[PDB]
Amino acid sequence: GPNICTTRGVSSCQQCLAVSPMCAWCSDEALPPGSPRCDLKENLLKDNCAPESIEFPVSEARVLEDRPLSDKGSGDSSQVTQVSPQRIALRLRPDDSKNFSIQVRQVEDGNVDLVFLFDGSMSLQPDEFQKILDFMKDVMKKLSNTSYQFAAVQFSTSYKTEFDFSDYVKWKDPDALLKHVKHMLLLTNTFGAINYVATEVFREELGARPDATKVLIIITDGEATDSGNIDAAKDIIRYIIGIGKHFQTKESQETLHKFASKPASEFVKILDTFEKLKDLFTELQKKIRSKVELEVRDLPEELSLSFNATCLNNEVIPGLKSCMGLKIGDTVSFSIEAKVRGCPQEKEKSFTIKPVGFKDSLIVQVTFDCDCACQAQAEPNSHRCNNGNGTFECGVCRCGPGWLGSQCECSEEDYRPSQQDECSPREGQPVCSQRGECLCGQCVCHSSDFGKITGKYCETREL
Ligand SMILES: *[C@@H]1O[C@H](CO)[C@@H](O)[C@H](O)[C@H]1NC(C)=O
Ligand SMILES: *[C@@H]1O[C@H](CO)[C@@H](O)[C@H](O)[C@H]1NC(C)=O
Ligand SMILES: [Ca+2]
Helix, strand or coil, X not given: CCCHHHHCCCCCHHHHHCCXXXXXXXXXXXXXXXXXXXXXXXXXXXXXXXXXXXXXXXXXXXXXXXXXXXXXXXXXXXXXCCEECCEEEEEECCCCEEEEEEEEECXXXXXXXXXXXXXXXXXXXXXXXXXXXXXXXXXXXHCCCCCEEEEEEEECCCXXXXXXXXHHHHHCCHHHHCCCCCCCCECCCHHHHHHXXXXXXXXXXXXXXXXXXXXXXXXXXXXXXXXCCCHHHCCCEEEEEEECHHHCCXXXXXXXXXXXXXXXXXXXXXXXXXXXXXXXXXXXXXXXXXXXXXXXECCCCCEEEEEEEECCCCCEEECCCEEECCCCCCEEEEEEEEEECCCCCCCEEEEEEEECCCCCCEEEEEEECCCCHHHCCCCCCCCCCCCCCEEEECCEEEECCCCCCCCCCCCCCCCCCCCHHHCCCCCCCCHHHHCEEEECCEEEECCCCCCEEECCCCCEEEC
């Protein structure tokens, strides 16, 4: 049962490869033109196509850089490795796919650049504002000897950095970092405050680490008094904590959703009192650095990925690019499939697959294997195609303007292949009255200076 490679009526080696990854092509030259050309390599070999003429590329995945994951008890010896492998060379056929895998293992503490964006509006009692200050001092005192880095920004009507990352690293003293804070006692411009942090606090000159996890703890006691968008803070993991009587109604709590990351059930936290601020972050802190999540950069438009995750105790979750509830030294893995659509023009592209908050990454160098190697001697104007009327690449003719056929001979389109038996009017007769040649199931009459020959079967001579 002639399958996809044979059926599609292909006219060259390139679109034969473009039919399907399983298709191979024969370029024998010496072969009855109406023989099969695009088929599986086994079927091509089953007929007597010259075995060395067969073109059958195969997609492949080759590991280039495969530093092993670092173990627990790791000194910075050529730095630590948390993603393996780190570079892979992918070669893909037209519309083909190829799987690969990566192990991820959090070897190090986990670098987090955390910003406190705390409400300083007029609604806060002097004690409540102090509870917020002591909350931040508590968090920083509890995390002094970790890879956490802290910045704090008070916002009301205005936005003010009380200290940034370079200030925290330099002093490491929560009391001294916050001693100058004066309660603003004004409005609640949450939109502009989040934009301020995203562009004016998360900056490398001010101590921010470019590969660290960006976290935003927003503490507020009322709805925002400004408006706009926070597109500039899309790359920051944003928690928001609404505290007090102004978030009693579920309506008021829902206004906070657009400020926090998704889903709101994870990143929006509602409290009735400021006393519960100590215990609340204690639980938040457990989900900040306990999750590996794959992040795809520079993925070409013609490429699509699918992920199957093995997330501790061999729970094989199809669809997931993340695993949560991880500890130091745990190892997870992801099976990744990359399918291309057709064949892009730029034949070499790269992209990155990286865990959020990691410097380690997997770079995937892609090359698309679409052309046939028999473009070597493609013989334009070949004597196999009516002398000039066709280019002879890969053992067949690619017909120039006008002409058609196996050899570029049939000129005016026969269209419907039908049969050569439509060249003689009845079963046993010779074709074209013996005054012409059957070309693509249609008679083409012998030319003579003695007179024209016409008719469907070249029966009429005009002397
Ligand atoms: C800070 O914590 C790390 C974590 O083990 C420890 O190795 C280091 O000695 C601590 N520093 C001080 C000054 O205690
Ligand atoms: C994910 O698992 C499904 C079912 O086992 C399989 O069909 C698919 O190829 C897998 N994908 C990858 C990228 O391994
Ligand atoms: Ca308020």
